[PDB]
Amino acid sequence: LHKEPATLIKAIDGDTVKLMYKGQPMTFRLLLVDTPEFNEKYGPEASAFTKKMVENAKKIEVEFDKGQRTDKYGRGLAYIYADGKMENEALVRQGLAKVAYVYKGNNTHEQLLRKAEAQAKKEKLNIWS
Ligand SMILES: Cc1cn([C@H]2C[C@H](OP(=O)(O)O)[C@@H](COP(=O)(O)O)O2)c(=O)[nH]c1=O
Ligand SMILES: [Ca+2]
């Protein structure tokens, strides 16, 4: 997989973000995770977390997996890095997301995320509390 540039357009919620990619605005959905919706429990915390992460970053990158790059809503499907740190993994590690939506052929970082989920769960963090 390879990291590609993008710039923040705007934070949306825990697992979506509006970024500029190849010079075009796109809503991105974070691969392999599910944050609560803003209205659900930990929804606000997930949203705040991703927002702080992207807004504080000097360098945002997107990394597409092997399979489909856009979902049925036209959202880009990627791993998103903030100053080299993977937001998808960070959310799971903090118990602010679950590993979810693992579809064959877009699952490169599946095991990395499940390991983070196991740690979050051990620590009874947030959603696991
Ligand atoms: C993460 C991801 C979501 N989706 C679609 C599946 C779900 O369909 P449905 O909308 O029909 O439930 C939806 C969940 O996204 P959200 O968790 O953002 O709602 O997004 C994909 O198709 N591929 C993916 O990789
Ligand atoms: Ca969600």
mmCIF file of C-alpha atoms and ligand atoms in Angstrom:
data_model
loop_
_atom_site.group_PDB
_atom_site.id
_atom_site.type_symbol
_atom_site.label_atom_id
_atom_site.label_comp_id
_atom_site.label_asym_id
_atom_site.label_seq_id
_atom_site.Cartn_x
_atom_site.Cartn_y
_atom_site.Cartn_z
ATOM 1 C CA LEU A 1 0.000 0.000 0.000
ATOM 2 C CA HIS A 2 1.096 3.590 -0.488
ATOM 3 C CA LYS A 3 0.525 6.838 1.308
ATOM 4 C CA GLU A 4 -0.815 9.728 -0.805
ATOM 5 C CA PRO A 5 -1.203 13.416 0.033
ATOM 6 C CA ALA A 6 -4.417 15.159 0.955
ATOM 7 C CA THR A 7 -5.436 18.299 2.840
ATOM 8 C CA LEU A 8 -8.218 18.713 5.414
ATOM 9 C CA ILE A 9 -11.357 20.401 4.166
ATOM 10 C CA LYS A 10 -13.391 19.640 7.306
ATOM 11 C CA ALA A 11 -13.907 17.233 10.174
ATOM 12 C CA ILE A 12 -17.264 15.460 9.985
ATOM 13 C CA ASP A 13 -17.572 12.764 12.706
ATOM 14 C CA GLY A 14 -15.727 9.744 14.202
ATOM 15 C CA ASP A 15 -15.204 7.827 10.974
ATOM 16 C CA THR A 16 -15.826 10.323 8.130
ATOM 17 C CA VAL A 17 -13.866 13.409 7.074
ATOM 18 C CA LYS A 18 -13.895 15.814 4.137
ATOM 19 C CA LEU A 19 -10.480 16.021 2.499
ATOM 20 C CA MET A 20 -9.070 17.383 -0.724
ATOM 21 C CA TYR A 21 -7.546 14.530 -2.733
ATOM 22 C CA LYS A 22 -5.907 14.946 -6.191
ATOM 23 C CA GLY A 23 -7.301 18.496 -6.017
ATOM 24 C CA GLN A 24 -10.971 17.414 -5.574
ATOM 25 C CA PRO A 25 -13.134 17.539 -2.424
ATOM 26 C CA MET A 26 -14.134 14.036 -1.227
ATOM 27 C CA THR A 27 -15.800 12.631 1.866
ATOM 28 C CA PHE A 28 -13.688 9.749 3.204
ATOM 29 C CA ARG A 29 -15.001 6.785 5.217
ATOM 30 C CA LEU A 30 -12.293 5.143 7.440
ATOM 31 C CA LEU A 31 -11.709 1.486 6.483
ATOM 32 C CA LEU A 32 -12.265 -1.342 8.954
ATOM 33 C CA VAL A 33 -13.882 0.742 11.731
ATOM 34 C CA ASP A 34 -17.208 1.890 13.135
ATOM 35 C CA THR A 35 -17.565 4.842 15.464
ATOM 36 C CA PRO A 36 -20.878 5.517 17.259
ATOM 37 C CA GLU A 37 -22.989 8.220 15.499
ATOM 38 C CA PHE A 38 -22.734 11.721 16.967
ATOM 39 C CA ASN A 39 -26.071 11.166 18.696
ATOM 40 C CA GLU A 40 -25.017 7.815 20.288
ATOM 41 C CA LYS A 41 -22.918 7.126 23.374
ATOM 42 C CA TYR A 42 -19.197 7.990 22.774
ATOM 43 C CA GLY A 43 -20.285 9.504 19.445
ATOM 44 C CA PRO A 44 -19.283 13.014 20.559
ATOM 45 C CA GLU A 45 -15.925 11.757 21.937
ATOM 46 C CA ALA A 46 -15.112 9.854 18.741
ATOM 47 C CA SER A 47 -15.897 12.985 16.655
ATOM 48 C CA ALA A 48 -13.766 15.220 18.890
ATOM 49 C CA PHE A 49 -10.904 12.746 18.708
ATOM 50 C CA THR A 50 -10.705 12.545 14.908
ATOM 51 C CA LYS A 51 -11.257 16.326 14.634
ATOM 52 C CA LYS A 52 -8.364 17.107 16.950
ATOM 53 C CA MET A 53 -6.242 14.563 15.134
ATOM 54 C CA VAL A 54 -6.863 15.963 11.636
ATOM 55 C CA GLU A 55 -6.992 19.637 12.558
ATOM 56 C CA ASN A 56 -3.712 19.478 14.492
ATOM 57 C CA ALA A 57 -1.863 17.542 11.744
ATOM 58 C CA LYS A 58 0.689 19.288 9.594
ATOM 59 C CA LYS A 59 0.518 16.400 7.110
ATOM 60 C CA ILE A 60 -2.560 14.287 6.254
ATOM 61 C CA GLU A 61 -2.152 11.189 4.030
ATOM 62 C CA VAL A 62 -4.626 8.784 2.552
ATOM 63 C CA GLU A 63 -3.857 5.164 1.922
ATOM 64 C CA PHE A 64 -6.183 3.085 -0.267
ATOM 65 C CA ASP A 65 -6.307 -0.661 0.187
ATOM 66 C CA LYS A 66 -6.237 -3.303 -2.605
ATOM 67 C CA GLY A 67 -9.955 -3.299 -3.379
ATOM 68 C CA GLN A 68 -12.700 -0.831 -3.895
ATOM 69 C CA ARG A 69 -11.699 2.803 -3.370
ATOM 70 C CA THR A 70 -15.203 4.308 -3.202
ATOM 71 C CA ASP A 71 -18.302 2.989 -1.463
ATOM 72 C CA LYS A 72 -21.907 2.982 -2.771
ATOM 73 C CA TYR A 73 -22.404 6.534 -1.440
ATOM 74 C CA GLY A 74 -19.331 7.838 -3.334
ATOM 75 C CA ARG A 75 -17.270 8.065 -0.112
ATOM 76 C CA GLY A 76 -13.558 7.260 -0.541
ATOM 77 C CA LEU A 77 -12.461 4.249 1.516
ATOM 78 C CA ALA A 78 -8.954 4.637 2.962
ATOM 79 C CA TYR A 79 -6.708 4.520 5.967
ATOM 80 C CA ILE A 80 -6.088 8.088 7.055
ATOM 81 C CA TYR A 81 -2.803 9.184 8.651
ATOM 82 C CA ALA A 82 -2.203 12.294 10.690
ATOM 83 C CA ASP A 83 1.468 13.169 10.870
ATOM 84 C CA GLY A 84 2.230 9.523 10.170
ATOM 85 C CA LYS A 85 -0.213 8.156 12.746
ATOM 86 C CA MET A 86 -3.107 6.013 11.512
ATOM 87 C CA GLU A 87 -6.401 7.448 12.684
ATOM 88 C CA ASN A 88 -8.257 4.171 12.047
ATOM 89 C CA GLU A 89 -5.944 2.342 14.490
ATOM 90 C CA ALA A 90 -5.878 5.204 16.965
ATOM 91 C CA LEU A 91 -9.712 5.258 17.300
ATOM 92 C CA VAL A 92 -9.826 1.508 17.872
ATOM 93 C CA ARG A 93 -6.858 1.676 20.294
ATOM 94 C CA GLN A 94 -8.711 4.241 22.401
ATOM 95 C CA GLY A 95 -11.997 2.251 22.407
ATOM 96 C CA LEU A 96 -13.712 5.001 20.396
ATOM 97 C CA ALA A 97 -14.358 2.626 17.493
ATOM 98 C CA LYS A 98 -14.976 -1.090 16.881
ATOM 99 C CA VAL A 99 -13.315 -3.121 14.162
ATOM 100 C CA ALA A 100 -16.177 -3.488 11.656
ATOM 101 C CA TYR A 101 -17.035 -3.721 7.960
ATOM 102 C CA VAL A 102 -14.169 -6.060 7.151
ATOM 103 C CA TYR A 103 -14.701 -6.943 3.491
ATOM 104 C CA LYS A 104 -12.442 -9.388 1.632
ATOM 105 C CA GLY A 105 -9.709 -7.614 -0.356
ATOM 106 C CA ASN A 106 -9.860 -4.299 1.544
ATOM 107 C CA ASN A 107 -8.526 -5.658 4.816
ATOM 108 C CA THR A 108 -4.779 -5.149 4.805
ATOM 109 C CA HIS A 109 -4.658 -3.627 8.302
ATOM 110 C CA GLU A 110 -7.279 -5.924 9.828
ATOM 111 C CA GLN A 111 -4.957 -7.741 12.226
ATOM 112 C CA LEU A 112 -3.196 -4.527 13.347
ATOM 113 C CA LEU A 113 -6.591 -3.060 14.267
ATOM 114 C CA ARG A 114 -7.871 -6.205 16.031
ATOM 115 C CA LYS A 115 -4.725 -6.170 18.158
ATOM 116 C CA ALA A 116 -5.503 -2.545 19.123
ATOM 117 C CA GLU A 117 -9.120 -3.495 19.904
ATOM 118 C CA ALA A 118 -7.907 -6.302 22.178
ATOM 119 C CA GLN A 119 -5.756 -3.792 24.114
ATOM 120 C CA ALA A 120 -8.585 -1.213 24.347
ATOM 121 C CA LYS A 121 -10.938 -3.933 25.580
ATOM 122 C CA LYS A 122 -8.395 -5.190 28.185
ATOM 123 C CA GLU A 123 -8.147 -1.626 29.501
ATOM 124 C CA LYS A 124 -11.955 -1.296 29.524
ATOM 125 C CA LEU A 125 -11.599 1.941 27.550
ATOM 126 C CA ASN A 126 -14.564 4.052 26.550
ATOM 127 C CA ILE A 127 -16.957 1.784 24.614
ATOM 128 C CA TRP A 128 -15.459 -1.215 26.449
ATOM 129 C CA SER A 129 -15.951 0.409 29.889
HETATM 130 C C1 LIG B 1 -16.561 1.078 6.045
HETATM 131 C C2 LIG B 1 -17.407 0.724 4.841
HETATM 132 C C3 LIG B 1 -18.743 1.047 4.832
HETATM 133 N N1 LIG B 1 -19.521 0.714 3.746
HETATM 134 C C4 LIG B 1 -20.981 0.957 3.703
HETATM 135 C C5 LIG B 1 -21.617 -0.303 4.343
HETATM 136 C C6 LIG B 1 -22.859 0.236 5.106
HETATM 137 O O1 LIG B 1 -23.995 0.154 4.195
HETATM 138 P P1 LIG B 1 -25.383 0.721 4.789
HETATM 139 O O2 LIG B 1 -25.439 2.316 4.745
HETATM 140 O O3 LIG B 1 -26.364 0.183 3.830
HETATM 141 O O4 LIG B 1 -25.663 0.262 6.294
HETATM 142 C C7 LIG B 1 -22.400 1.694 5.442
HETATM 143 C C8 LIG B 1 -21.943 1.954 6.892
HETATM 144 O O5 LIG B 1 -21.311 3.230 6.805
HETATM 145 P P2 LIG B 1 -21.572 4.083 8.153
HETATM 146 O O6 LIG B 1 -21.030 3.313 9.443
HETATM 147 O O7 LIG B 1 -20.838 5.351 7.913
HETATM 148 O O8 LIG B 1 -23.108 4.394 8.262
HETATM 149 O O9 LIG B 1 -21.301 2.040 4.603
HETATM 150 C C9 LIG B 1 -18.967 0.013 2.712
HETATM 151 O O10 LIG B 1 -19.678 -0.338 1.766
HETATM 152 N N2 LIG B 1 -17.655 -0.284 2.665
HETATM 153 C C10 LIG B 1 -16.872 0.002 3.734
HETATM 154 O O11 LIG B 1 -15.703 -0.325 3.643
HETATM 155 CA CA CA B 2 -20.488 5.112 12.034
#
